[PDB]
Amino acid sequence: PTSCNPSDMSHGYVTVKPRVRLHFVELGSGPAVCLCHGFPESWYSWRYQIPALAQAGYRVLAMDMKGYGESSAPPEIEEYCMEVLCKEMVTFLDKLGLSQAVFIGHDWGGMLVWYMALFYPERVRAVASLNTPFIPANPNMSPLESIKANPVFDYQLYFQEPGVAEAELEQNLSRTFKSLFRASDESVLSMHKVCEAGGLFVNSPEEPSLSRMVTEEEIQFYVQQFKKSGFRGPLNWYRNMERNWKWACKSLGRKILIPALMVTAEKDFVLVPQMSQHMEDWIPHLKRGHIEDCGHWTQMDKPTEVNQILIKWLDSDAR
Amino acid sequence: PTSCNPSDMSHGYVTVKPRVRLHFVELGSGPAVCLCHGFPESWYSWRYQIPALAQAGYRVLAMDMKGYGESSAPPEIEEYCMEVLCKEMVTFLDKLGLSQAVFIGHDWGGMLVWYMALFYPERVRAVASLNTPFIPANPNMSPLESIKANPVFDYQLYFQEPGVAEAELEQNLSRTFKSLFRASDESVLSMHKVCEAGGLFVNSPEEPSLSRMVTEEEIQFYVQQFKKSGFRGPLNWYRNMERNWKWACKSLGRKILIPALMVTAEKDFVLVPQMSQHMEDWIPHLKRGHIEDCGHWTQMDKPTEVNQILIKWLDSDAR
Ligand SMILES: C[C@H](C#Cc1cccc(C(=O)NCC[C@@H](c2ccccc2)c2ccc(OC(F)(F)F)cc2)c1)N(O)C(N)=O
Numbered sequence: 125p126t127s128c129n130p131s132d133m134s135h136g137y138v139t140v141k142p143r144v145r146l147h148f149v150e151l152g153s154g155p156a157v158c159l160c161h162g163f164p165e166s167w168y169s170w171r172y173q174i175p176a177l178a179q180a181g182y183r184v185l186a187m188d189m190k191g192y193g194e195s196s197a198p199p200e201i202e203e204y205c206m207e208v209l210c211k212e213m214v215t216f217l218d219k220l221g222l223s224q225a226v227f228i229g230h231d232w233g234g235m236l237v238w239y240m241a242l243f244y245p246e247r248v249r250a251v252a253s254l255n256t257p258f259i260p261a262n263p264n265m266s267p268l269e270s271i272k273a274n275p276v277f278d279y280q281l282y283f284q285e286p287g288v289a290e291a292e293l294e295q296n297l298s299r300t301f302k303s304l305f306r307a308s309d310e311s312v313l314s315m316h317k318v319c320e321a322g323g324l325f326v327n328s329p330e331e332p333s334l335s336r337m338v339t340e341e342e343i344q345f346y347v348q349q350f351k352k353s354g355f356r357g358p359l360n361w362y363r364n365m366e367r368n369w370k371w372a373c374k375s376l377g378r379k380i381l382i383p384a385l386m387v388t389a390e391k392d393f394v395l396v397p398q399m400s401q402h403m404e405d406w407i408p409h410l411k412r413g414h415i416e417d418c419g420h421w422t423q424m425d426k427p428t429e430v431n432q433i434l435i436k437w438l439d440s441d442a443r
Numbered sequence: 444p445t446s447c448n449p450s451d452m453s454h455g456y457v458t459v460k461p462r463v464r465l466h467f468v469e470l471g472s473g474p475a476v477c478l479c480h481g482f483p484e485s486w487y488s489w490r491y492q493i494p495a496l497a498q499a500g501y502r503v504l505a506m507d508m509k510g511y512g513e514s515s516a517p518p519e520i521e522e523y524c525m526e527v528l529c530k531e532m533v534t535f536l537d538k539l540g541l542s543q544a545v546f547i548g549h550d551w552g553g554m555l556v557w558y559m560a561l562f563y564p565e566r567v568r569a570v571a572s573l574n575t576p577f578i579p580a581n582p583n584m585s586p587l588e589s590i591k592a593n594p595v596f597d598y599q600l601y602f603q604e605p606g607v608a609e610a611e612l613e614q615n616l617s618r619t620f621k622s623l624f625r626a627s628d629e630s631v632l633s634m635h636k637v638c639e640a641g642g643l644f645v646n647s648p649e650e651p652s653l654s655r656m657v658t659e660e661e662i663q664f665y666v667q668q669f670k671k672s673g674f675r676g677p678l679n680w681y682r683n684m685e686r687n688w689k690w691a692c693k694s695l696g697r698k699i700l701i702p703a704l705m706v707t708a709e710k711d712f713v714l715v716p717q718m719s720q721h722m723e724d725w726i727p728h729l730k731r732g733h734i735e736d737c738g739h740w741t742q743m744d745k746p747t748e749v750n751q752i753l754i755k756w757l758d759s760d761a762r
């Protein structure tokens with residue numbers, strides 16, 4: 125599929141709070157579709173979808189999420205709780221004069237668009253998530269306890285204390301992104317026992333090979349983006365589990381009634397497809413896509429499949 | 444009508460050439476409507492139309508024209524010929540992924556949108572001009588000669604030599620804009636015999652009163668905008684008459700066939716309504732509005748009337 129060159133894009137900026145402005149890239153005309161990337165990514169993670177969606181007749185707004193890229197990265201950890209992040213995205217729509225938008229997210233952006241649909245359905249025309257399932261909060265089980273009962277989420281405890289994971293991820297950015305952005309069959313990093321091994325990359329090469337999914341030029345773009353604000357803002361998305369849990373609990377007796385799509389990825393070994401298995405009981409109008417041979421980095425692993433799934437669903441359920 | 448606060452707007456930037464980026468403000472969803480201001484104005488001259496058009500179901504893109512505001516102001520005079528300006532606006536649409544837009548202009552922006560419709564009709568869904576008529580080039584009469592046969596366009600000869608009008612318009616910006624932005628019954632400046640009187644403001648108060656059309660805060664916004672690049676870029680729009688005439692002559696045997704609207708203003712003593720009188724012979728699908736008691740500064744003189752005319756025409760002929 126056709127990709128984006130960053131300097132041939134229209135760049136938009138919206139101030140949603142005194143020291144917080146959101147940056148986005150904008151392409152096409154038609155119904156507004158807002159794309160929300162995950163950790164640790166960029167608007168550029170949507171590079172294969174932006175031209176394709178615009179060509180299909182949508183107005184694509186591909187965000188730099190708060191903490192990333194050209195968006196502001198306030199220093200405070202609580203600025204990255206889901207409650208604040210969602211209300212800023214509503215303000216974003218307000219300042220653009222958009223009554224509604226389709227929201228499509230991946231990874232942490234998938235979590236965000238689910239909560240947008242849950243708490244601001246009147247502002248969400250339709251919602252789609254790649255990899256990230258929607259699991260309603262259990263008001264009887266705290267979040268950090270649910271993380272210890274699952275060993276693959278152990279890197280999340282390593283991410284908790286400010287400054288620790290930042291030093292490792294920032295020490296060599298090219299190594300960081302070449303180590304992360306890999307197909308499942310190429311994966312080089314261990315998510316289990318990160319805390320007993322000292323860090324996330326201790327048992328990965330100092331000069332890793334380039335994944336089949338990405339070019340050297342595409343890696344260097346992410347590198348350039350993360351030189352701006354570093355990893356603190358991105359990591360802060362993980363540092364609000366108790367507040368996110370308390371907020372999510374305030375919604376418990378309610379369903380998501382708007383058109384919705386869940387896209388699972390066969391080889392995402394962290395956000396595994398089985399984690400989505402009873403989403404229908406909460407989301408009555410939920411539709412599904414599923415991508416075989418697809419790892420965690422869904423948009424760049426299987427861009428053609430992603431594009432086909434999204435455009436078919438947009439054309440029937442969002443338009 | 445509701446106006447705009449500049450800090451609650453979404454701001455967009457598009458690079459159309461190596462050292463030229465266009466700034467615009469963006470509000471609403473629906474068909475793309477691009478608003479092009481005149482001399483010496485700003486996107487903010489559309490402040491009463493932007494919320495109203497967006498509320499009526501349009502996606503408003505209100506430009507800072509090249510040379511103004513947050514848009515680039517390259518130094519070269521030939522960068523502001525109509526030929527270059529229009530091709531940049533096509534590039535603008537290209538980079539936004541817009542196949543077409545409605546173009547609405549006033550004053551020099553009215554001239555620009557007429558030439559967009561003439562040379563790039565496939566990119567103009569519909570075209571509207573406030574005050575500025577469309578008069579096809581006379582290939583037998585040079586432009587500076589046509590200006591001497593009309594005494595009201597004598598300030599245009601004063602505008603020709605670089606640096607001269609700049610010194611007068613820049614010497615006190617608040618005085619400049621308070622002197623210009625006035626109703627016809629309040630007008631304080633003489634357009635005739637500017638060159639024999641030495642300048643444009645020689646016979647106007649050093650501390651002029653504030654027009655009924657504008658507040659002190661609105662004046663100071665223009666003042667702040669013109670501190671950025673000064674008047675050279677704006678004045679350069681007048682310094683390309685021979686090239687604009689040669690380019691316009693290349694189109695001579697052709698009509699404008701797209702939906703079109705000409706809005707005349709009873710009390711614009713420079714762009715007088717009579718100047719539009721045989722536009723129908725060139726623009727077969729031309730419709731008309733006419734605003735009584737309206738001077739040159741149409742959008743802020745009669746904003747409610749302008750809004751009503753534009754929305755009625757957009758809803759029938761552009762949508
Ligand atoms: C509320 C709270 C939560 C949450 C939550 C929600 C969405 C996403 C994430 C998340 O961590 N995304 C990063 C995954 C990424 C990664 C991992 C480590 C470091 C950097 C990047 C990765 C990379 C390769 C890979 O390949 C494979 F699959 F491993 F082979 C898989 C994943 C966390 N909570 O407690 C519960 N229960 O939701």
Ligand SMILES: C[C@H](C#Cc1cccc(C(=O)NCC[C@@H](c2ccccc2)c2ccc(OC(F)(F)F)cc2)c1)N(O)C(N)=O
Pocket residue numbers: 481482483550551554575586587589590598623627630634643684687710711712713714738739
């Ligand atoms: C191709 C070439 C051309 C052209 C062209 C096209 C469109 C617009 C203009 C233009 O000059 N716009 C500025 C008017 C403005 C002004 C005047 C002087 C200084 C600053 C601002 C003004 C202010 C108050 C006012 O009030 C009233 F009506 F006077 F009472 C009227 C006008 C020139 N050409 O040779 C021919 N023939 O088109």
